[PDB]
Ligand binder design. Sequence first.
Ligand SMILES: Nc1nc2c(ncn2[C@@H]2O[C@H](COP(=O)(O)OP(=O)(O)OP(=O)(O)O)[C@@H](O)[C@H]2O)c(=O)[nH]1
Ligand SMILES: Nc1ncnc2c1ncn2[C@@H]1O[C@H](COP(=O)(O)OP(=O)(O)CP(=O)(O)O)[C@@H](O)[C@H]1O
Ligand SMILES: Nc1nc2c(ncn2[C@@H]2O[C@H](COP(=O)(O)OP(=O)(O)O)[C@@H](O)[C@H]2O)c(=O)[nH]1
Ligand SMILES: COc1ccc2c(c1)CCCN2c1nc(C)nc2onc(C)c12
Ligand SMILES: [Ca+2]
Ligand SMILES: [Mg+2]
Ligand SMILES: [Mg+2]
Ligand SMILES: [Mg+2]
Lengths: 54, 427, 437, 332
Amino acid sequence: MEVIELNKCTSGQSFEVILKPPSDPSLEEIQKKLEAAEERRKYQEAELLKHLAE
Amino acid sequence: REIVHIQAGQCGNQIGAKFWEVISDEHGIDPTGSYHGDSDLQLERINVYYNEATGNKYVPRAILVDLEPGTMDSVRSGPFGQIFRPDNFVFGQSGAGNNWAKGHYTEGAELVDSVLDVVRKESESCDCLQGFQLTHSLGGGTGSGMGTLLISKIREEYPDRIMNTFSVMPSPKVSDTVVEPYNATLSVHQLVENTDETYCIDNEALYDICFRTLKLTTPTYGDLNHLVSATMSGVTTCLRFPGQLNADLRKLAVNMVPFPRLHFFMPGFAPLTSRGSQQYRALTVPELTQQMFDSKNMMAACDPRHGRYLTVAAIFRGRMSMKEVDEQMLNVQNKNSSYFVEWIPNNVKTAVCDIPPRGLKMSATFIGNSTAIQELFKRISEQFTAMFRRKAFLHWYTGEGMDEMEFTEAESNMNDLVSEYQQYQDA
Amino acid sequence: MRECISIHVGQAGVQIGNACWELYCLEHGIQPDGQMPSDKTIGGGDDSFNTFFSETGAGKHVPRAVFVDLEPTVIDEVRTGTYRQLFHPEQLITGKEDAANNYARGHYTIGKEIIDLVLDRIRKLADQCTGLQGFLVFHSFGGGTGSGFTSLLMERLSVDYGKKSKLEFSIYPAPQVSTAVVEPYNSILTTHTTLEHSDCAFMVDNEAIYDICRRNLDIERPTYTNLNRLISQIVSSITASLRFDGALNVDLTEFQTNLVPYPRIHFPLATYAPVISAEKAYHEQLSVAEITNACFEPANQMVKCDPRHGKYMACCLLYRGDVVPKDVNAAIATIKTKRSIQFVDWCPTGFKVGINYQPPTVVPGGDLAKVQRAVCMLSNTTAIAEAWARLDHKFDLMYAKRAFVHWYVGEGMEEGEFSEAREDMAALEKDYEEVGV
Amino acid sequence: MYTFVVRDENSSVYAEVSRLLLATGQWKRLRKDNPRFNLMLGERNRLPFGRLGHEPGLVQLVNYYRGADKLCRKASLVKLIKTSPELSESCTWFPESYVIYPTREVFLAAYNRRREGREGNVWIALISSEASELLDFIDEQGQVHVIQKYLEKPLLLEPGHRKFDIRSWVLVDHLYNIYLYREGVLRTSSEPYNSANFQDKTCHLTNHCIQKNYGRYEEGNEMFFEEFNQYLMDALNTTLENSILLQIKHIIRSCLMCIEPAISTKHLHYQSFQLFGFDFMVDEELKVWLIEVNGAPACAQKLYAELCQGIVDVAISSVFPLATSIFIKLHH
Ligand SMILES: Nc1nc2c(ncn2[C@@H]2O[C@H](COP(=O)(O)OP(=O)(O)OP(=O)(O)O)[C@@H](O)[C@H]2O)c(=O)[nH]1
Ligand SMILES: Nc1ncnc2c1ncn2[C@@H]1O[C@H](COP(=O)(O)OP(=O)(O)CP(=O)(O)O)[C@@H](O)[C@H]1O
Ligand SMILES: Nc1nc2c(ncn2[C@@H]2O[C@H](COP(=O)(O)OP(=O)(O)O)[C@@H](O)[C@H]2O)c(=O)[nH]1
Ligand SMILES: COc1ccc2c(c1)CCCN2c1nc(C)nc2onc(C)c12
Ligand SMILES: [Ca+2]
Ligand SMILES: [Mg+2]
Ligand SMILES: [Mg+2]
Ligand SMILES: [Mg+2]
């Protein structure tokens, strides 16, 4: 029912209509997690090369 | 994203040669390497399998390996023989005697480093090598023993690249020697560890397709390799032609292989054709879909109703209704839902390519990861054990330095593979 | 005037960026060489469209955009296509090999190799900004780059641009057009890692767009081109307030204030009408009432769900075309007496309405017909949580057998991040349930 | 072959429906959690409606209406009747009811004008004339339960001076057609009605299990319509259709037209039907009152066959066709 904050301009209008009232990680932490993943990839690869050397 | 192709041994090189013949025709490359096709789609991703040279010549990125020169002289004499890079022919003289051990430990060891030199020369040229495909049999000596030795060494030098094989499985119905179950069992153990993707091409299945379906009373290796080349063309379609998908070997592995060791695919093809026989009637999309899922169109002699599909890839080739392909593909899943594991949602994916293969207006190629593939490994396991319990024919192997333990281990690893497939069939 | 930088990540984001920027150009009268005759302030300006376009002394209007993909094929088509002259080469960033549909390959192994290059190219656009508002980030949930690289990009933007808003446009995975079996994994992983870093996210379920194309455009088998041109229209509706004179949603901060009263529940549902085929030779033009009513039919939503069985926390109507407040209020009063629209008790029951008089623009020889009036409704309803339920179920089915997990552990990810991401989704679903009943 | 899944192993009604489906030769039953189904006969508690209608190439149907629990819980049905202008509040076929919480003053207001008027002032959860024991009861229980004006002058069948309720079975299909099964059942007391002792349990509560005289006057304390209509003719010079069934049809049509906008699946990506049990009370002036609406009703053993076959005909085969109508369509 109540229209409010009606704003008009050349290219449009806006307004609000109410029907009833109511009733992060740091850079070092990221570069730490990215480097923990790389170590893990490196380890996994060393195991593969050790296995193929056997 | 370049692929380096290796073909090893008699079988490896015969199907390998037929592969380059078939795709060279699809891409419009003559036997001299000059392109005389008609559509830019044939060149858009020719980089995947061909190097360019002076005069804009296309040279297969292909390495030809054998421990005896016989079959490689035959390739050089063949129709497309003049297309391959001469330096990429790497052969010894002594042969391998259908002996895995000669391929892997003795004769093949003399020759392996020269093969790796050529592989390295081809890899070093690649803008961005995606990986390797190997063609070989598992029942002989060179492709089986030396092929898997190559795979081991390639992985050492290129550990972060994809290894893909087309591996022909021995069958008493198409048999050179009684030791094929030994050679296949020792190779399957290698394949389980050191490839991401192997197409299980089963000479039992190919023999049966030629006899029962194709009406070929006495099939030849030529009739079997016609089925193989049609399958190898189909399963590489998405690698060679531009599509919505723009597929590579690694995304294929990521989506087809839910568990590292279970990477043995069952390929299928429709419509099935014998050589020289031309089919004049088109298959409707419903017939392509029914036939391509038919047990009788499978290249691994396994009954898929005896297992369950982990993942499925289906590639359709030709001018056809994409809507009809979707409905028919969906229709297969809904009507047979029990045969697709419920714990991988939407595990059947579809690709379409406008270019049909030679001589067909429509075709379908099927790549299934079914737990029914265990049937193949159990069949080889039984044949292996029948000999091994009496230690029969083993001297051919202990005379090249192998020990019985290595056989015991190989058997055990393959039985483990079988029960692992069994584990997901009851899940 | 405050600038906004658009970042398009992976195939889905890049291709949708193409669609939107083509449309922005037609809407603002910018030619493909980047010239804009109607703009008389040569070399610069602080007009509303300069929110999305910088200016060169030679009159070129350059999108404040960066495209980033881990593989060159898709951005290579921007580099050669109709709008090639629009973008500076430094704005188009490609690697050599993609994430292979694998969140962990996009986030960790490959993402770590290219994050610094992307941030410096972004830094080069931010430096041209007198008052940067924040970022609009376009990507798929399911792609490995889309999911894995975006989440890393989002973590860093929070670090480098701490006080700037970040909006997402996120393509939710549908099996009819996806070809990756692992998209539930990627979706959960990226949603978990990004949630704290995103202020407001518009999810677009490809399943919803696909059926709208089938049903309303009579397209037997929609392509990415069909889907993206329709998506770009919705995106245009949402961003129009940043690019045009107006009083409603004028800065990114305003999207969060108007649509998101609780930080984690920041996925507004979008509904768009009318979608009419260009092939339709006879078409009766739909009224304000008809198209506002269409906003509460689930068949017009960007995600299929039933808002009748949730609760609203906020609701905006964005009209384009011949629309005046009288007709909107008349239409709203009728709808209220005929539909199930319950708000949470701690929010007023109401609509924030914006009207731009220029009717929607359509790509010549595209699929959408030109209409006399259109509307995009942005409502924050708990009903959208059905999409989390669907996704989480598919995730649980696969993870219970650890299917495909080895592909992620092999890029250096830990199995624990799967259950960490899934626990967060579980908490998300429970937040929506509390608010919703 | 169409496909269906079964997620309510206790449903007497759909146990039969799935046997009928299977014995058609054109329906295959799937494992519970297989998502590639045509028909879901679902769980009663937390049926995942949000997962329905997202399988391409499958029209999906479910035997429950999301939101219909507003009509099928006693607390919700009261709120729905007082707030919806389509019914409220001088809705004249529902007993004056009030919701009450344990951790009410409106209810005391009518109870006190009841006492000041010295009228019949007995209510029900469980029955009493003093609100204090109705409330001293409510809190030593631990749950929400409405209390309701107890009908002190109920129609009583003879011989027996006995009370009863009428259960009607109503099927609502995916088109929101409202189908009333032509067979109803009367669930009788076999104990004579006793105005002077409400603690005395059996003669007031007409529940088929809560009769444990059971069977004296007719098999299973169930009188079907042929006999009840005959009785109303010989006893009262009227028919069942005229004196009772018009009001039952009005109440059913009214209740279901009310929630139509909130539960209809007309434009939805998945479709619903649902079977309901309406429970009625008839007073000595032959006025029908709604007692209660039951969302997962059982049937009566005589009628299981006919009704379930009709659930297939109108609700399932209308959506998935195969390769003398037991319902009355209530028009709207
Ligand atoms: N709506 C829409 N969805 C797309 C588009 N392209 C891809 N998708 C969807 O996005 C998902 C796949 O993610 P992509 O963006 O293609 O993958 P990516 O981000 O490039 O990551 P990788 O290829 O894995 O390195 C699937 O669900 C597709 O259906 C597009 O252009 N429009
Ligand atoms: N206001 C009222 N006036 C008279 N009798 C009433 C009444 N409310 C309930 N009853 C009696 O109480 C019995 C049970 O009532 P309720 O209405 O609580 O259903 P139930 O949950 O007990 C089983 P169903 O769901 O099958 O009805 C009815 O059979 C009826 O005889
Ligand atoms: N399908 C097919 N199988 C073959 C071919 N040649 C050999 N085989 C099979 O491969 C096995 C023999 O191995 P082969 O390749 O000849 O031994 P190698 O030369 O040492 O590698 C046997 O099982 C044969 O049946 C062929 O051309 N096609
Ligand atoms: C079961 O989910 C699949 C199956 C396969 C694939 C994908 C997903 C994604 C892209 C790669 N990919 C494919 N890769 C190749 C070389 N050929 C193919 O043919 N069809 C498909 C599909 C396909
Ligand atoms: Ca200017
Ligand atoms: Mg041989
Ligand atoms: Mg990509
Ligand atoms: Mg009850």
